[PDB]
Amino acid sequence: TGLKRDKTKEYNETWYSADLVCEQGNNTGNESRCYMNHCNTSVIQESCDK
Amino acid sequence: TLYVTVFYGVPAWRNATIPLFCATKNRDTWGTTQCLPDNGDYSEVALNVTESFDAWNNTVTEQAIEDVWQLFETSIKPCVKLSPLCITMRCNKSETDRWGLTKSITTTASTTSTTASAKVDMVNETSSCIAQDNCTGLEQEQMISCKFNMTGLKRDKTKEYNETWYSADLVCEQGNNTGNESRCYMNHCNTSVIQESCDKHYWDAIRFRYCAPPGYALLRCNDTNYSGFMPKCSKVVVSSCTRMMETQTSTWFGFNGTRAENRTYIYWHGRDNRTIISLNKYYNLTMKCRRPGNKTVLPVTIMSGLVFHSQPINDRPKQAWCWFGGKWKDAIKEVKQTIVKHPRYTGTNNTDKINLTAPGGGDPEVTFMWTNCRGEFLYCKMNWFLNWVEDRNTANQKPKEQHKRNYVPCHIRQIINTWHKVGKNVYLPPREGDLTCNSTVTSLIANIDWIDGNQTNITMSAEVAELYRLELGDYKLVEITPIGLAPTDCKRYT
Amino acid sequence: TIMSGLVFHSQPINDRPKQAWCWFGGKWKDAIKEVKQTIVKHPRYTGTNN
Amino acid sequence: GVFVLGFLGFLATAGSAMGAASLTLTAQSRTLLAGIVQQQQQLLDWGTKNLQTRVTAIEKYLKDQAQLNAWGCAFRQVCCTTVPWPNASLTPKWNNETWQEWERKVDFLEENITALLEEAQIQQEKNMYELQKLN
Amino acid sequence: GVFVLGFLGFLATAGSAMGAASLTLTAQSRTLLAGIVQQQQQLLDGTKNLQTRVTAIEKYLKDQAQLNAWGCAFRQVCCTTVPWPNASLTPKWNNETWQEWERKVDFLEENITALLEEAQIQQEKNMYELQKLN
Amino acid sequence: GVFVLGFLGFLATAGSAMGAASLTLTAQSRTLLAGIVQQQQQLLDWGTKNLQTRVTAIEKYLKDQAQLNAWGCAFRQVCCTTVPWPNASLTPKWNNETWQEWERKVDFLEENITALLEEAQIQQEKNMYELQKLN
Ligand SMILES: *[C@@H]1O[C@H](CO)[C@@H](O[C@@H]2O[C@H](CO)[C@@H](O[C@@H]3O[C@H](CO[C@H]4O[C@H](CO[C@H]5O[C@H](CO)[C@@H](O)[C@H](O)[C@@H]5O)[C@@H](O)[C@H](O)[C@@H]4O)[C@@H](O)[C@H](O[C@H]4O[C@H](CO)[C@@H](O)[C@H](O)[C@@H]4O[C@H]4O[C@H](CO)[C@@H](O)[C@H](O)[C@@H]4O[C@H]4O[C@H](CO)[C@@H](O)[C@H](O)[C@@H]4O)[C@@H]3O)[C@H](O)[C@H]2NC(C)=O)[C@H](O)[C@H]1NC(C)=O
Ligand SMILES: *[C@@H]1O[C@H](CO)[C@@H](O[C@@H]2O[C@H](CO)[C@@H](O[C@@H]3O[C@H](CO[C@H]4O[C@H](CO[C@H]5O[C@H](CO)[C@@H](O)[C@H](O)[C@@H]5O)[C@@H](O)[C@H](O[C@H]5O[C@H](CO)[C@@H](O)[C@H](O)[C@@H]5O)[C@@H]4O)[C@@H](O)[C@H](O[C@H]4O[C@H](CO)[C@@H](O)[C@H](O)[C@@H]4O[C@H]4O[C@H](CO)[C@@H](O)[C@H](O)[C@@H]4O)[C@@H]3O)[C@H](O)[C@H]2NC(C)=O)[C@H](O)[C@H]1NC(C)=O
Ligand SMILES: *[C@@H]1O[C@H](CO)[C@@H](O[C@@H]2O[C@H](CO)[C@@H](O[C@@H]3O[C@H](CO[C@H]4O[C@H](CO)[C@@H](O)[C@H](O)[C@@H]4O)[C@@H](O)[C@H](O[C@H]4O[C@H](CO)[C@@H](O)[C@H](O)[C@@H]4O[C@H]4O[C@H](CO)[C@@H](O)[C@H](O)[C@@H]4O)[C@@H]3O)[C@H](O)[C@H]2NC(C)=O)[C@H](O)[C@H]1NC(C)=O
Ligand SMILES: *[C@@H]1O[C@H](CO)[C@@H](O[C@@H]2O[C@H](CO)[C@@H](O[C@@H]3O[C@H](CO[C@H]4O[C@H](CO)[C@@H](O)[C@H](O)[C@@H]4O)[C@@H](O)[C@H](O[C@H]4O[C@H](CO)[C@@H](O)[C@H](O)[C@@H]4O)[C@@H]3O)[C@H](O)[C@H]2NC(C)=O)[C@H](O)[C@H]1NC(C)=O
Ligand SMILES: *[C@@H]1O[C@H](CO)[C@@H](O[C@@H]2O[C@H](CO)[C@@H](O[C@@H]3O[C@H](CO)[C@@H](O)[C@H](O[C@H]4O[C@H](CO)[C@@H](O)[C@H](O)[C@@H]4O)[C@@H]3O)[C@H](O)[C@H]2NC(C)=O)[C@H](O)[C@H]1NC(C)=O
Ligand SMILES: *[C@@H]1O[C@H](CO)[C@@H](O[C@@H]2O[C@H](CO)[C@@H](O[C@@H]3O[C@H](CO)[C@@H](O)[C@H](O[C@H]4O[C@H](CO)[C@@H](O)[C@H](O)[C@@H]4O)[C@@H]3O)[C@H](O)[C@H]2NC(C)=O)[C@H](O)[C@H]1NC(C)=O
Ligand SMILES: *[C@@H]1O[C@H](CO)[C@@H](O[C@@H]2O[C@H](CO)[C@@H](O[C@@H]3O[C@H](CO)[C@@H](O)[C@H](O)[C@@H]3O)[C@H](O)[C@H]2NC(C)=O)[C@H](O)[C@H]1NC(C)=O
Ligand SMILES: *[C@@H]1O[C@H](CO)[C@@H](O[C@@H]2O[C@H](CO)[C@@H](O[C@@H]3O[C@H](CO)[C@@H](O)[C@H](O)[C@@H]3O)[C@H](O)[C@H]2NC(C)=O)[C@H](O)[C@H]1NC(C)=O
Ligand SMILES: *[C@@H]1O[C@H](CO)[C@@H](O[C@@H]2O[C@H](CO)[C@@H](O[C@@H]3O[C@H](CO)[C@@H](O)[C@H](O)[C@@H]3O)[C@H](O)[C@H]2NC(C)=O)[C@H](O)[C@H]1NC(C)=O
Ligand SMILES: *[C@@H]1O[C@H](CO)[C@@H](O[C@@H]2O[C@H](CO)[C@@H](O)[C@H](O)[C@H]2NC(C)=O)[C@H](O)[C@H]1NC(C)=O
Ligand SMILES: *[C@@H]1O[C@H](CO)[C@@H](O[C@@H]2O[C@H](CO)[C@@H](O)[C@H](O)[C@H]2NC(C)=O)[C@H](O)[C@H]1NC(C)=O
Ligand SMILES: *[C@@H]1O[C@H](CO)[C@@H](O[C@@H]2O[C@H](CO)[C@@H](O)[C@H](O)[C@H]2NC(C)=O)[C@H](O)[C@H]1NC(C)=O
Ligand SMILES: *[C@@H]1O[C@H](CO)[C@@H](O)[C@H](O)[C@H]1NC(C)=O
């Protein structure tokens, strides 16, 4: 959800192979649950300057 | 033969660009942290030398604009952030329709006649115009009320409150909704988070001198013919520190100026048609502004331990207005006469063809006026004051502008950007109780526009920073170089 | 935009391009042998000379 | 105030011509004598209050004094030097010429004069050491 | 330590009488000589910042400039043309410490400084005129 | 540049022997002339930039002057002192020894010599003025 804290807005971001970890299990849905590579250890910043 | 010789203590100088120490008198919180307490000396010594001075290309002038803005940045940095309150607020449909935010008007609009009589009303303090508002009409209402939840510090439960914005502080989502509640957001909460002004800034006048560090002196051009680009001063006076300076920001005018004088001198920016005019302190050009209805403020806590000052008042007083007063029309005409004789301005000399008019509308920033007094800003149409000052044919736009009056209507905006440098957006808390602010007009912001040999305009401009160029326009900063090299036949010897 | 007034860049590309690669180039094999020869004659390195 | 007039008294000679101008040594010393006093006063109770210019106030003093120490003319109103004058057309008019009016005319070659005299003092400095070593 | 006693050795003169008082040069010079060394030591590895570090520098240049301001640098006793103020306050060189009399003159000390500053300028101006003449 | 050559000229004689070396006074004074303007130039437009080391340049300069003036030999290439030489085994070789080389040999006893002179200057300081007080 964006700055207007009253509604949602779906995007898609296309990651790479070496920047995701996916849950392994018996799920059959075509959707695969995955998280960012390193967001469960620390908060990551953006190389935001040039 | 001749040999080089070194002399120390020679009184010479040169241009320089160094920061300056600020000194202030009424330091509620800004003293001992950024500015020293004042000394209280203003003696100056005249020198029989000539030096060049500029009001726009001056280091002191440029720094003053930076320092005021820089000072304001530190004040709002620790204050609270209003990010949470950017949520849909239920609002009274019958009340937003009246001011046209929704623009949902159907049928109605019955025909009515216009009396078109008299409309030369004038007011002075003895009358009942001041006491009760009530001044010929057109001062009716300005308010809107809404609701929001805003769970507080205890992040487990909500508590619905009410806050009443103004017309120019909300943007509403038009739709085919028949419900009596009109969903409507804040003005600029989807662009950048706005932080309050939870301080005493804008609640009291700010003055502070400028003192150069040791080894640097300030020079002032005391010639009465100073215009801004004159590099030959017959009279020049050295000083240790500058005079006071008012830090009030306004459009079309400058209030509480310290450089008021019996003469209507004009400061001209020779490089183009940028201009500022100083009025006279002989006509008592005082102006008083009032807003009715004594207000209540109910602080509300958000999930940061800080407080958001709301206005749950349900009263509906008349909108703010100002009546100026004093001898105006006789005062203005002297400005036009001065322009004729001033150097430059190779234009017409017909006094009753040079006319003072507002710019061509467009953005609300330049269309309206803007005056700040004791924390609550006011913007006013100013059409009537312009209409009455010149006594022009009242065929201007709709019938609402037909009248010639000494007072003008105003409204309140609370989501205001600091006009000083570029932008931003801040929230000004509302003052409890009634406000009545009185001030003396002592300057004029105007760009003089004329393309042909006829019909020159004294066009107003909305450059707030131009005021600071009148306070220290004649000041120059010079670095002292006490080293002097001249020839001498004497040799070092042994 | 996120709930801080700031922006997070994203890559919504859907087309699939060829993977990245680098091809070096230039006379390289002749270079590394000179590096090998220098180590042989370098002081220290009490090691083989073949 | 006395300090205000005292700090502004140095420039009172700016209107006079070079020949009739009265020099004022110690002016910079007196300038910094009370500057710290004003800064110190009421201080007991971004760079303006901080050291953006306070060091610059110190820096201006040391530069000027170190300038004299480098040239070996400290604590002297006038020091004759062995260096000759440059191109002589720019002759000061000691009757009807202010210091400032002429400092700008020589400003064009001021930088070159600085370099020339610095080398001269070193050469004289070298001579002094040789004489002392001899004896 | 030697420095500790050295900084604390000057004040030993306090008990001594004015006439028997031993004037000491280098009192401030040596104090800043080692204080910078003390803070410099282990610094390689406000109080730490320049809140007060320059204040020592400011204090040093204050007295050094004052000596140069009066044109008496490095002269334990420089005679000046200034005449003495009110003669009621006369030092008792036999049984008076420096501070027992310094406080009494402190009331008029400011005027002496202001009066003496003008006197140096007058003498200063004479030197330039004599040098210019010849 | 002249400044680059000028500032680096101090070590130009570092290779020379003790006697043949030409001492260079004003090295700190001349350096403070041109080093500071490098910082000042274009500054008009954390620690290294503003105040951590900028003052350290000032602190370094005052140390030499304070150290010099505490010993009472400022503005003098050579001043004779009353203090006798310490253990004489470290006799300088005026023909085939460099200043820094010989300085490293004295560094062991450098600290002790410093203390002896400071006390010695105090004694002369007490005597020199007391004679003026005497007569
Ligand atoms: C151009 O210049 C013009 C000339 O200056 C400007 O117009 C002037 O603007 C100044 C502000 O810069 C105004 O002064 C302020 O007025 C405030 C309101 O005054 C009311 O009361 C007046 C009666 O008081 C009389 O007696 C007092 C004491 O002797 C005397 O000072 C005063 O002048 C008057 O003779 C009445 O005449 C008025 O009409 C109002 O009804 C006043 O409160 C201000 O004082 C503040 O602020 C100062 C520091 O500036 C403090 O030292 C004070 O203690 C006081 O602070 C208290 O009040 C603040 C405001 O209410 C609060 O914010 C503070 O928190 C504080 O205490 C509050 O909280 C307490 C908690 O217990 C409560 O108990 C308190 O009651 C408080 O609520 C200041 O004097 C001028 O009045 C005004 N003049 C005119 C003619 O308009 C003009 O604005 C400039 N141009 C522009 C564009 O603005
Ligand atoms: C320290 O601080 C002080 C302030 O406290 C500083 O003082 C200011 O310093 C600047 C720069 O030194 C000055 O700017 C310069 O001003 C001169 C003079 O301007 C006036 O005279 C002009 C004369 O021109 C006529 O006469 C000549 C013969 O003399 C003829 O040849 C011409 O054709 C003309 O007929 C006049 O033209 C000017 O008119 C301006 O003002 C009037 C209102 O009075 C307007 O209506 C005009 O439209 C116009 O704006 C003015 O009256 C200027 O001549 C200089 O401009 C030249 O240089 C500019 C920058 O390079 C350039 O953009 C211009 O086009 C012009 O170009 C000249 O130079 C080029 C490069 O050499 C050449 O290639 C070119 O051919 C041409 O020769 C310049 O703007 C300020 O006046 C001065 N004072 C103030 C108050 O600002 C000081 O500088 C600081 N520093 C120091 C070290 O002191
Ligand atoms: C730029 O700024 C100048 C400076 O003020 C401004 O000039 C003013 O212009 C107006 C016109 O728009 C002038 O008003 C006119 O004044 C003349 C002169 O009368 C003088 O003397 C009498 C005594 O004999 C005084 O009472 C009077 O106040 C003046 O001092 C009048 O003769 C004009 O008469 C009007 O009314 C008549 C009926 O009574 C009509 O027959 C006549 O045509 C005029 O009609 C205009 O005014 C009517 C008033 O009701 C109105 O209904 C009409 O529709 C029409 O508008 C007239 O009053 C004023 O004196 C000028 N003042 C000055 C100082 O120059 C420019 O107008 C202004 N221009 C722009 C473009 O900004
Ligand atoms: C503040 O505002 C005022 C108006 O409110 C400006 O006044 C105008 O200033 C400009 C300056 O450029 C004037 O233009 C000049 O006109 C002169 C008149 O001769 C002929 O000008 C043009 C052709 O140039 C003809 O169309 C006209 O009919 C005249 O026959 C010219 O001599 C000038 O020529 C110079 O400038 C032009 C470019 O503009 C060059 O091509 C030429 O080679 C030459 O260098 C000039 O054109 C204009 O007339 C003024 N308006 C008037 C008088 O009503 C002020 O300039 C403005 N302040 C500042 C600082 O700009
Ligand atoms: C040189 O210095 C001496 C030393 O101070 C000085 O003598 C002093 O003069 C002051 C006056 O300036 C005396 O002050 C008096 O003190 C007595 C108590 O000791 C008071 O009773 C006096 O009160 C009267 O005067 C007041 C001053 O206006 C009035 O307000 C009051 O109503 C009384 O009328 C007065 O304060 C002081 O006692 C002496 N002595 C000392 C030791 O201070 C001398 O005047 C100076 N001379 C010069 C030429 O400088
Ligand atoms: C003045 O300084 C000189 C220079 O140091 C000093 O004479 C020299 O002292 C050093 C050591 O301080 C001697 O070096 C010797 O080296 C041999 C090995 O080569 C060691 O065996 C020696 O040890 C004996 O001598 C020491 C003192 O010299 C004793 O403390 C120790 O217990 C051993 O008995 C020693 O390390 C060097 O040989 C001498 N002579 C020279 C360099 O000609 C001289 O003593 C100093 N004057 C004094 C102290 O009055
Ligand atoms: C994720 O990225 C993809 C791009 O690869 C976005 O897909 C596009 O989504 C739009 C609608 O949001 C599609 O438009 C619609 O397509 C259907 C196809 O049958 C058509 O019937 C509709 O009339 C309409 O044109 C578009 O085709 C589609 N493009 C693709 C898949 O290549 C998708 O929107 C992104 N996800 C988001 C924004 O949440
Ligand atoms: C702003 O919000 C507050 C709630 O936070 C509103 O308070 C409410 O005010 C109404 C009107 O006074 C109260 O109505 C009551 O109704 C009973 C019915 O019997 C009557 O007896 C009372 O005398 C009173 O009229 C209501 O109880 C009250 N609610 C709370 C929780 O306080 C306030 O009205 C709002 N401001 C407005 C609408 O201007
Ligand atoms: C001095 O003020 C007058 C009054 O506003 C200026 O006249 C105005 O000039 C603008 C620009 O040309 C006009 O805008 C256009 O006018 C036409 C009709 O001419 C209209 O059809 C367009 O929609 C547009 O509004 C404006 O009308 C005109 N106003 C009047 C009352 O004549 C004048 O330009 C100013 N002086 C200078 C030098 O600009
Ligand atoms: C984990 O997931 C796999 C894949 O869906 C499951 O595999 C089935 O397991 C059951 C027995 O539990 C077999 O009867 C099926 O033949 C297996 N294949 C399929 C396609 O269903 C597996 O059982 C899951 N693990 C569990 C349930 O513990
Ligand atoms: C500016 O005024 C000063 C006086 O305040 C003038 O200084 C005098 O100039 C005359 C010129 O002949 C000399 O004879 C005097 O000796 C100068 N000093 C005094 C005290 O009068 C100065 O000349 C004036 N300069 C200008 C340009 O008018
Ligand atoms: C757009 O809004 C108007 C006004 O709200 C809607 O007009 C309504 O139309 C319906 C029938 O479609 C009527 O039953 C209602 O009485 C009308 N008035 C209101 C207030 O609802 C209109 O239908 C809307 N158009 C849409 C949603 O497409
Ligand atoms: C100004 O008005 C007069 C009179 O109507 C006219 O002749 C002249 O042309 C006008 N000015 C211009 C530049 O046209």
Coordinates of N, CA, C and O in Angstrom, one line a residue, chain B residues 18-25 27 30-39 63-64 66-68 70-71 206-213 218 240-245 247 472, chain D residues 38-39 41-42 46-50 53:
Chain B
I18 N 31.9 36.3 3.8 CA 32.1 35.5 5.0 C 30.8 35.4 5.7 O 30.0 36.4 5.6
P19 N 30.5 34.4 6.5 CA 29.3 34.3 7.3 C 29.3 35.4 8.4 O 30.4 36.0 8.7
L20 N 28.2 35.6 9.0 CA 28.0 36.6 10.0 C 27.3 36.1 11.2 O 26.5 35.2 11.2
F21 N 27.6 36.7 12.3 CA 26.9 36.4 13.6 C 25.7 37.2 13.7 O 25.6 38.4 13.4
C22 N 24.6 36.5 14.2 CA 23.3 37.2 14.3 C 23.1 37.5 15.8 O 23.5 36.8 16.7
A23 N 22.5 38.6 16.1 CA 22.2 39.1 17.4 C 20.7 39.4 17.5 O 20.1 40.1 16.6
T24 N 20.0 39.0 18.6 CA 18.6 39.2 18.8 C 18.3 39.7 20.2 O 19.1 39.5 21.1
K25 N 17.1 40.3 20.3 CA 16.7 40.9 21.6 C 15.8 40.0 22.4 O 16.0 39.5 23.5
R27 N 14.8 36.8 22.6 CA 15.1 35.4 22.3 C 14.3 34.4 23.2 O 14.8 34.1 24.3
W30 N 15.6 31.0 20.6 CA 16.6 31.0 19.5 C 17.9 31.7 19.9 O 18.8 31.9 19.1
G31 N 18.0 32.2 21.2 CA 19.2 32.9 21.7 C 20.0 31.9 22.4 O 19.5 30.9 23.1
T32 N 21.3 32.1 22.4 CA 22.4 31.3 22.9 C 22.6 30.0 22.1 O 23.6 29.3 22.4
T33 N 21.7 29.7 21.2 CA 21.9 28.5 20.3 C 22.3 28.8 18.9 O 23.1 28.1 18.3
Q34 N 21.8 30.0 18.4 CA 22.2 30.5 17.1 C 22.6 31.9 17.0 O 23.4 32.3 16.2
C35 N 22.1 32.7 17.9 CA 22.3 34.2 17.9 C 22.6 34.7 19.3 O 22.0 34.2 20.3
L36 N 23.6 35.6 19.4 CA 24.0 36.2 20.7 C 22.9 37.2 21.1 O 22.1 37.7 20.3
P37 N 22.9 37.6 22.4 CA 22.1 38.8 22.8 C 22.7 40.1 22.3 O 23.9 40.2 22.0
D38 N 21.8 41.1 22.1 CA 22.2 42.3 21.5 C 23.1 43.1 22.3 O 23.2 43.0 23.5
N39 N 23.9 44.0 21.6 CA 24.8 45.0 22.3 C 24.1 46.3 22.5 O 24.0 46.8 23.6
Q63 N 22.7 36.2 2.2 CA 22.7 35.4 3.4 C 21.5 35.6 4.2 O 21.0 34.6 4.8
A64 N 20.9 36.8 4.3 CA 19.7 37.0 5.1 C 18.6 36.1 4.7 O 17.9 35.6 5.5
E66 N 18.9 33.2 3.2 CA 19.3 31.9 3.5 C 19.1 31.6 5.0 O 18.6 30.6 5.4
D67 N 19.5 32.6 5.9 CA 19.5 32.4 7.3 C 18.1 32.2 7.8 O 17.8 31.3 8.7
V68 N 17.2 33.0 7.3 CA 15.8 32.9 7.8 C 15.2 31.6 7.4 O 14.6 30.9 8.3
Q70 N 17.0 28.8 6.7 CA 17.7 27.8 7.4 C 17.2 27.7 8.9 O 17.1 26.6 9.4
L71 N 17.0 28.9 9.5 CA 16.5 28.9 10.9 C 15.2 28.1 11.0 O 14.9 27.4 11.9
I206 N 9.9 38.6 14.9 CA 11.3 38.2 15.0 C 12.2 39.3 14.4 O 12.0 39.7 13.3
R207 N 13.1 39.8 15.2 CA 14.1 40.8 14.8 C 15.5 40.4 15.2 O 15.6 39.8 16.3
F208 N 16.5 40.7 14.4 CA 17.8 40.3 14.8 C 18.8 41.1 13.9 O 18.7 41.1 12.7
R209 N 19.8 41.8 14.5 CA 20.8 42.5 13.8 C 21.8 41.5 13.2 O 21.8 40.3 13.5
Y210 N 22.7 42.0 12.4 CA 23.8 41.3 11.8 C 25.1 42.0 12.2 O 25.3 43.2 12.0
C211 N 26.0 41.2 12.8 CA 27.3 41.7 13.2 C 28.4 40.9 12.5 O 28.4 39.6 12.5
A212 N 29.3 41.6 11.8 CA 30.4 40.9 11.1 C 31.5 40.5 12.1 O 31.7 41.2 13.1
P213 N 32.2 39.4 11.9 CA 33.3 38.9 12.8 C 34.4 39.9 12.8 O 34.5 40.7 11.8
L218 N 31.4 46.7 7.9 CA 30.2 46.9 7.0 C 30.1 48.4 6.7 O 30.3 49.3 7.5
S240 N 29.8 48.9 12.8 CA 30.1 47.5 13.3 C 29.0 46.5 13.1 O 29.4 45.3 12.9
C241 N 27.8 46.9 13.1 CA 26.7 46.0 12.9 C 25.5 46.7 12.2 O 25.5 48.0 12.2
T242 N 24.6 46.0 11.6 CA 23.5 46.5 10.9 C 22.4 46.9 11.8 O 22.4 46.6 13.0
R243 N 21.3 47.5 11.3 CA 20.1 47.8 12.0 C 19.3 46.6 12.2 O 19.5 45.5 11.7
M244 N 18.2 46.7 12.9 CA 17.2 45.6 13.0 C 16.6 45.3 11.6 O 16.9 46.0 10.7
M245 N 15.9 44.2 11.6 CA 15.2 43.8 10.3 C 14.0 43.0 10.7 O 14.1 42.1 11.4
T247 N 11.2 40.2 9.9 CA 11.2 39.0 9.2 C 9.8 38.5 8.9 O 9.4 37.4 9.1
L472 N 18.4 45.9 4.1 CA 19.9 46.0 4.1 C 20.4 46.3 2.7 O 21.4 45.8 2.3
Chain D
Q38 N 33.2 40.4 23.1 CA 31.8 40.4 22.7 C 31.3 39.0 22.5 O 30.2 38.7 23.0
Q39 N 32.1 38.1 21.8 CA 31.7 36.7 21.7 C 31.6 36.0 23.0 O 30.6 35.3 23.3
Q41 N 31.2 37.4 26.0 CA 30.1 38.0 26.9 C 28.8 37.4 26.5 O 28.4 37.2 25.3
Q42 N 28.1 36.9 27.5 CA 26.8 36.3 27.4 C 26.8 34.9 26.9 O 25.8 34.2 26.8
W46 N 25.2 26.2 13.3 CA 25.6 25.7 12.0 C 27.1 26.2 11.7 O 27.7 25.6 10.8
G47 N 27.5 27.2 12.5 CA 28.8 27.8 12.2 C 29.0 29.2 12.6 O 30.1 29.7 12.7
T48 N 27.8 29.9 12.8 CA 27.9 31.3 13.3 C 28.3 31.3 14.7 O 29.3 31.8 15.1
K49 N 27.4 30.7 15.6 CA 27.8 30.4 17.0 C 28.9 29.4 17.0 O 29.8 29.5 17.9
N50 N 28.9 28.4 16.1 CA 30.0 27.4 16.0 C 31.2 28.0 15.3 O 31.3 29.2 15.1
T53 N 33.3 30.6 11.4 CA 34.0 31.8 11.3 C 34.8 32.2 12.5 O 35.7 33.0 12.4

